[model samples]
Target: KYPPLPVDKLEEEINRRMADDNKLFREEFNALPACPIQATCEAASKEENKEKNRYVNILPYDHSRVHLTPVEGVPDSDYINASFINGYQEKNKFIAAQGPKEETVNDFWRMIWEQNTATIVMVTNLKERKECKCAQYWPDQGCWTYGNVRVSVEDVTVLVDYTVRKFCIQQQRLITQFHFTSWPDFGVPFTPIGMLKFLKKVKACNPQYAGAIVVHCSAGVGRTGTFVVIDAMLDMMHSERKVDVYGFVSRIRAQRCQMVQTDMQYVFIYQALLEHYLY
Candidate 1:
């Protein structure tokens, strides 16, 4: 087991580590090979599909990108603004995706159905600052059809900072979606406690033995990446008795470009982890 340290000591160590992470971010993180696998970022940026992307700066690589299986009478795209992210000791354990667009909402549901995603953690609202961030994919209460996939809200539970909605998809399979309302675009949560509470709720809904959970924010890199890092690192801490924040971020970034998008987000992971484990 990894040696335990006092809470104060842990905070100090986290601070030091975050400093190192920021320095690395400034000096080396952006310079890493972005399009080393499958399709280059350059290639993803040059067509009609480029306009489909939420952020031109962020594109999912072809190799790790999630392709929606073609369905009869349903249109599809080679790109859905989504990428497969490996989890702790599990490959293809999570799908990190951008918020569904008006046009790609059907494709998003298709990917979810095709991939058999059991849970979806949405980190952004439909709108922020009078600007559209994500499309309202799920129905308010009843059945909604996106292509051939039908989604019905089985139940909705409102929380202080988030809302938990259970949906029945395709008239049989159940998909739980956790919608966090407090997170702003390119910003941190007001308090780590609320975020941790939501995280624990998600954890309870999807256990380690379960299938991959789908996670998305507006661009699916900043808050999405931070949440993924926290979940994976906390799992590592309990299972391996160690936490390697830098290594964890690096590994995910290799799989999905520009994960943990900003230095503040990188620091937010450490903050969330320390708050969850220590206090």
Candidate 2:
């Protein structure tokens, strides 16, 4: 675990990075490598499972990937393009998942049902600049069955920077969806303040003891990694009066590859944390 530094120390670090236009953040980000994997993704690499993944290279590590119940005759039925990402003090607080491909949408819902997920946080638009980023995993108004889970949209609350929807899953469990719509395709949010407010709403929607939140972007690492780090870092800051941008980023990469995906996204964490302190 990374030791927490004083809040003021964090402020100074933020200030120093801001002054240099985050060149140092770029350097620090470049120095860290992949999770140094001893864990193998044999399940993901299987010939049958290849079509289930969204990307060729972004496979989940075997030790931490979320497992689905075996589907009777299906071989390697447990695989999904998702990984269990730990929070500040909570284990498996978030499931970093790839956006549901058309063929894998059923598996995506199955992962949610099996994991007992109460909140689904999407950090990318369904269609960006005319390209499909994520499959239409849930219904627009009424009930839709994805494999074993039946999801019904109870309500939709549209907001400026984000949207929230309530759903009843399998008619037995209730789940919340937080879709962040304003994030640009190739870069970070336009302003840190908006992202901070969006984060606050997501935090409020999640019940403390509910199942792990499902978080994803496209390939499941970049924007998804950014959201998890910011949320987890805020929890650490508020609870322990300290934060670790680099440490936590490196940590999640071990659990799932390419978290905090880009140096720019890494820089945005600092910017958002600064805004959070002010708010």
Candidate 3:
């Protein structure tokens, strides 16, 4: 080489390279625009254009429209708890095996066999060994799985843990909400594609009993709203439903206020939909 560079000179050169790389990284990150909530914002901005707008209806699946009669007991009630089955329960007991409801836990189990509807449980928090009846439920065709969404509250952790453990033991599939502030925080834009993956997982597991996913935050409005909207959008695309994304979200917001709580999550959904067209 030309005369060996002094240690000080090499040190300065290395520092310069590092500085340049950091600057480049900053530029790339900044160049990435905030994820767009195109559908949500478009619906909000065009609230007056009701007839033309796409709207999402968050109403519970009308039991009357279908002939499936729900079995009696708190367990069956949990299955039909909402438009979505959010988590699991032990028999009739909503808590775990060691939980206070230990005495009367099998109510859900009885309903599953009687109703012929698969049981779905959210067990995102329990240890494997502690998961009671999970594996047993699987061979019987009853569903026992973990709900993956985490609520930023106390006393909920144990329940989540129990659900997760149960799912692992039962070998059932799970689809839970991933909590993140923004796209950068999550390393990807919030999009219908992500939600599609979740729905796909649920469908793959119990096809007939693969229940609708229930994504709820504390209020079930902000992040949860966004997640559900994306889920609906994906369903629209897959089913070839004749509805635009904007109109779809508007319809949902008509019944549920402040849905898709944050503007960013809303935008990411649009971005995902746009990408879906290209792919």
Candidate 4:
């Protein structure tokens, strides 16, 4: 009988052949592009990030990402002047029940009430100064600013559950996301610029046609900050007004309180600006 080929040798031989084929293929690929367009390369890079960041690295992003579909009979301009109101009565009661101390109760009510208002009315959510624990409260760690408005059934469901009750309260327009968790993933420093584009698309779909947006996550700092910075930049590029980052941030803080939480978050916003497109 012929001696059996050594298993390791056979494996190495197979790998070597595969490598040779791959090298040849690579050569062909390289020959195909002598001086590839920068846009093509950038687009490919973006696609790669989308592929790599898809779910695992990116997390909580849905391809069907909700858009702002318009609802008939709803006056868009009417919404412009409307004020924000908080509807988390249950949470408020719970907070109150947990506290009897006058000061503590007052503080709890104050914080929750303010956040509810921000969540409902304002484009950004910032906790009050001195006594606002809205940041410490449920899913209120980050700072959110208004960007674009979009609407979807999922958003409607969330708003109804979080803001309204089961009763069908007028034909309500709402914003929805394919995934909420990805908001946090994009907060990482190295995340791509495409995310900003994605967010803009989402905003464009707002039923309210809101030019402003309210961004929120469990903790307000990371995801909320990321969304707002990108949004402001886009506004800067489009609008006639000069875009001052410090002034923008100061205004955001003035509306709420302490929109800037960590120094790192602030730094990330500046760094992200360097990129033409940020995910």
Q: lDDT of all the models against the reference?
A: 0.77, 0.86, 0.33, 0.31
Poorest 10 consecutive residues by lDDT, candidate 2: 1-10
TM-scores, each model vs. reference: 0.86, 0.95, 0.36, 0.36
By the TM-score metric, which is better: model 2 or model 3?
2
- Determine the C-alpha RMSD for candidate 1 after optimal superposition of all C-alphas: 3.8
Q: Write the per-residue lDDT of candidate 1 for residues 171-261, one digit (tens) a residue.
A: 2788899998888655577568888888888988875555678999989887888888888877876775566676667667777888887
Report residue 112 deviation for candidate 2 (angstroms): 1.1
Candidate 1 regions with alpha-carbon error over 4 angstroms: 1-9, 17-39, 46-48, 72-76, 207-210
TM-score of 2: 0.95
Candidate 4 segments exceeding 4 Å error:
1-174, 178-180, 183-189, 208-212, 240-242, 277-279
lDDT of 4: 0.31
**Model 3 TM:** 0.36
Residue 92, model 1: lDDT of 83
Backbone collisions counted per model: 0, 0, 38, 24
C-alpha RMSD between model 4 and the true structure: 21.9
lDDT of 2: 0.86
TM-score of 4: 0.36
The candidate with the higher TM-score, 1 or 2, is: 2
**Residue 155's C-alpha lDDT in candidate 4?**
22
